[PDB]
Amino acid sequence: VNPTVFFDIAVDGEPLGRVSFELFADKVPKTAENFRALSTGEKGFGYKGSCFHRIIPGFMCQGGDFTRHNGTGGKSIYGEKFEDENFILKHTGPGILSMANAGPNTNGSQFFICTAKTEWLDGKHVVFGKVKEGMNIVEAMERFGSRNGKTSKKITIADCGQLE
Amino acid sequence: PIVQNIQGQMVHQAISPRTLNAWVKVVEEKAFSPEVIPMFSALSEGATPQDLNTMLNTVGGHQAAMQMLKETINEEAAEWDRVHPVHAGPIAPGQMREPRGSDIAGTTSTLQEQIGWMTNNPPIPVGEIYKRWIILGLNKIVRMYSPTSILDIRQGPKEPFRDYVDRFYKTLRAEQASQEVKNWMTETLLVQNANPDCKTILKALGPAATLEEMMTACQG
Amino acid sequence: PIVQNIQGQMVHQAISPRTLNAWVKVVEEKAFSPEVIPMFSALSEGATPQDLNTMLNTVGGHQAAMQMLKETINEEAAEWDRVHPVHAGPIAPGQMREPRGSDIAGTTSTLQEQIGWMTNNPPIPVGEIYKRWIILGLNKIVRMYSPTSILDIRQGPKEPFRDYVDRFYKTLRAEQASQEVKNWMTETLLVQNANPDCKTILKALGPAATLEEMMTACQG
Amino acid sequence: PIVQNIQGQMVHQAISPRTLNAWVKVVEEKAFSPEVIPMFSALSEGATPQDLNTMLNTVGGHQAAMQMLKETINEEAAEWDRVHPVHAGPIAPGQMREPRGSDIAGTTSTLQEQIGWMTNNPPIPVGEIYKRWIILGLNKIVRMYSPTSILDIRQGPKEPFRDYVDRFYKTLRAEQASQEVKNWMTETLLVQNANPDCKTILKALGPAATLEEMMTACQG
Amino acid sequence: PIVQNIQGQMVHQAISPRTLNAWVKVVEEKAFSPEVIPMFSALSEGATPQDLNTMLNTVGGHQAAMQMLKETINEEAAEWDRVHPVHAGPIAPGQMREPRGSDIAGTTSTLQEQIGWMTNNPPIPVGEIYKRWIILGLNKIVRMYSPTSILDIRQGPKEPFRDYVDRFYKTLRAEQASQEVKNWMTETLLVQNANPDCKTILKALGPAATLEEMMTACQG
Amino acid sequence: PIVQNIQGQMVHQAISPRTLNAWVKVVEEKAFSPEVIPMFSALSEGATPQDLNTMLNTVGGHQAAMQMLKETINEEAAEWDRVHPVHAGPIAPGQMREPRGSDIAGTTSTLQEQIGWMTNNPPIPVGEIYKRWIILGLNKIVRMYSPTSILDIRQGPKEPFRDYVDRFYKTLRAEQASQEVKNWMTETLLVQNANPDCKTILKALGPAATLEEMMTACQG
After folding, report:
1. A34, A52, A121, A128: which one is catalytic?
2. Neighbors of chain F by Cβ distance (3+ pairs < 8 Å)
3. How far apart are CA A72 and CA A54, in angstroms?
4. Out of A23, A38, A62, A128, which one is annotated catalytic?
5. Which residues of A touch F87 (CB under 8 A)?
6. Is the dihedral of CA D54, D59, D63, D65 positive or negative?
7. Number of folded domains in chain A?
8. DSSP class per residue in C98-149
9. Residue A150 belongs to what domain range?
10. For A65, B4, C188, D4, which has the most beta carbons within 10 A of its beta carbon?
11. This protein's superkingdom (chains B, C, D, E, F)?
């Protein structure tokens, strides 16, 4: 019933590990379909070969800008941006997958994986999934980031797709 | 157009002459009216860019409309190339190079490459993109063919209310300025331009009146 | 529309162009007759809401009737939402999607969601519900297109009983009422409005006589 | 109206007389014009429902407009009661019960309850809700006090273009049917009703013309 | 009045000269309109009976109205003293004695007793009762001041509907009947006294007549 | 507008009604003249964008000028967006996000966000930027409201030099041009358009004569 997608992560081309995500399509369906479809690449464009452009140790890893590769772009499967579906789920801990945005109703394709409990984000970013397998791969990724987000090595989504 | 097999996979299939004949006949007989876009979208479901270029080049006559459609497709392809630059260098073995705007149009690419794009993993919907572009062009064309403007509608003393509302909604569907503007127009301009007798019969029902009672009032 | 595919697994098959051409032709040739409802119900058996939207968009002309149809579909969706709101209850162990008034009308529901709602076990009758709505709308349209009231049907001085009863039953079928009202009307109105020459003949047969007896009586 | 202190907390404050005097003077001197709503929204920032009932009851004259506003507030209060139903069962220790549709207006509640509602944790914005309702009522009032419709605008042969566009935009801001429909009107109706000479001078610049060049064309 | 210090005791404060200046200005310029009562209740908020006596004595002229107001205050004080026994004898410290009617009027006491009664626990508000009595008196005055009755309003042949409803609602605001009788008259006599043309217009409007609908119907 | 509050902590203070009344009066009598831009800049020192929106909404009449101002504000916002791109992403807990092109105009930016952008260290000059935009708009409007051009200013036969130079400098200040062009414009136009006798009187003084000597030449 709820889809599961994976990401095979790479640090400058060396394979690092697989993170897999359960998308809560039963509560945030339109948000979960957009991440699912961008992971499969079935609509022609997507996450494969994009990188995490902003990694802040102890906060979150952000990625998903496949058009401009630096947080200023990305687009959804419904157009460039769409509404905040709802705020049922909250940022309860590491592994929560939440939507990045540029204020309300500006969701595109950027997402962030929390590596800590970030309750201040509640009510401001739609949560739509959580890490299933691979959280120590997300944790190891932190080491390649910095206080301001700049990463030291290129961290890419080498491959991604749907598992179930 | 691609068609699925018994085991679920799909492979290219030659375009049926019946589809081309029906498309040309409906274009000739029904000219360029609002009801060509649904039939066009229904006729060429899953059609390759070559099939769409066929269905467009095969339309004899109305060459100005076809030139408008070609210009619209050209502008859309230029915008697509500007928003999605293609990479250079060697291409990965498991991936085929991404198409450019002129190649999304299907003008400078072979049919086998279109089939490979459409049946790739993950599939690339070049046919759907070019169909969206053609549908936008056809919307602009049916906008151009619109005979009269929406504001110039005024019912004659003898023209029945049925013909009046028919003409009104015809040019309204041909306008396609927006949806909420259309909703405001069908509230205001519809009742603003009635014949005085039936006009006051409609005003007797107030603005809360619906179209059914609006018509059966002036009926009989 | 989806169809049972060998073996036992329903897969989506897009609407065939020949079906759309048949629908356009029957709407062009027969306008809006009482019989179209059965032809529409038989041309779109088990159709996804997208197919019915395509078949309602491919119509040419009669935009007023299509507007009444769309408005009645909206009203049925509104009433459906009112009759089927989510009341608090313990969550079901198994979750199945759910069709909204807008999810049933095929407006905001993607084709995959409708295929899911149809092929899932237990199935959600979205197609039959939308067909009931469109059939109610078509009944409204065909009852509006009636040229004259059933009460005005009267036989000419030399108009044969054949054409008289044909036109009378045609207008009665186009007319809308309960079955008992029709049972009373066929006994109170048919014999009275007949031509006196054959009216005496029908009166000589009896009040509760059947149609064939009167028809062979005034035959010739 | 509540006011913040040095420590940061807020407490009720008696309404200042030269606010009531200014409101009564602007209501009488300017009567009803689109620029009474911004003045009202600026005068009563943070005012309790009692203060708004004061500012409304204090308006002598134009009692029909005040009754329209009362009726609009009445209907709005009923909708709020219908949309949210009070929950049953035990109430949390850190929370206490909410107001009703009629008590949002402050008709059947004392001032201390309004202050407790406005400075609760979390605060409940009854003042802002009632201000929104009053602003909607004032919008309907200034709609009624519009002296013409948007379509009847036709510039006279001698009436300058400046006065024409002033009247147009005045009755357009007084229309407030929508925002995108306003955007379509300012493109079509503005260019469609000019005097023939200046009309064709504006047509010389095409639809891409902006308002500045639109006026400096007919200028001089 | 009694200003509540921010995080502190409710310190007493003498009435500012601005309040009395505005009060004498409005009572001089506007005579005795229905709205003056709201403005009087607005200017004097949380004021001691000494403040209200100062606000009433400063009124210059219209001494008959002042004598009627004093007679009404005396009647209310007599009723209060009749339906409330007054205790006497030694009184426990820290607890003020029973407020008498002539004392609740402030004519037989100083500011200290009023401040004590408005600061006791539980509070005994003398201001909200003396202001109620003054409002009853001002209501009698404004009823006496009305030039024409409500039952004798008739619309002129040329006088439009707006002026007629203005005069009608002004006289209704000046009326003395209960609220249910007020609703009855504003429901019936409004349309029952209009000019015959718009009378028939509003009769065609039928039941559920609402003021904005009435004024939109009688346009032109 | 925010103001330095004792001690050293800026807190939000809502716009005072007296300032709004002064603005309405200066836009009622002065209307649109060169002096309004300086008056506006002084009445709105350090104002949040909400205060400037309130001051621009309260203007009654002159809707064409307000629409020009709104359109120029939109144009400046688009140019600011094209020059200062805003990157999307989660904000830092300590610092605020970079305001977009529409966050300056107070359209989609809440009052708290503006207060943050102003009181933060380093401060974001949203108020001064919006003031520069409104000042550009007001310059456009006051250069439009000019009745005649500076080239058309000519002295009457007996019209004294005082009124001529006053009107000429007033029109020159209302006109829009670089100061460097004005330096040639004055020395080319002031003496030439004067009366012939005063023309020779000023030419006797010399070409580079100052304004005071030129004045005292034809004094009386």
Report:
1. A121
2. A, D
3. 12
4. A62
5. 70-72, 102
6. negative
7. 1
8. ---HHHHTTSS--HHHHHHHHHSSSPP-HHHHHHHHHHHHHHHHHHHS-SS-
9. 1-164
10. A65
11. Viruses
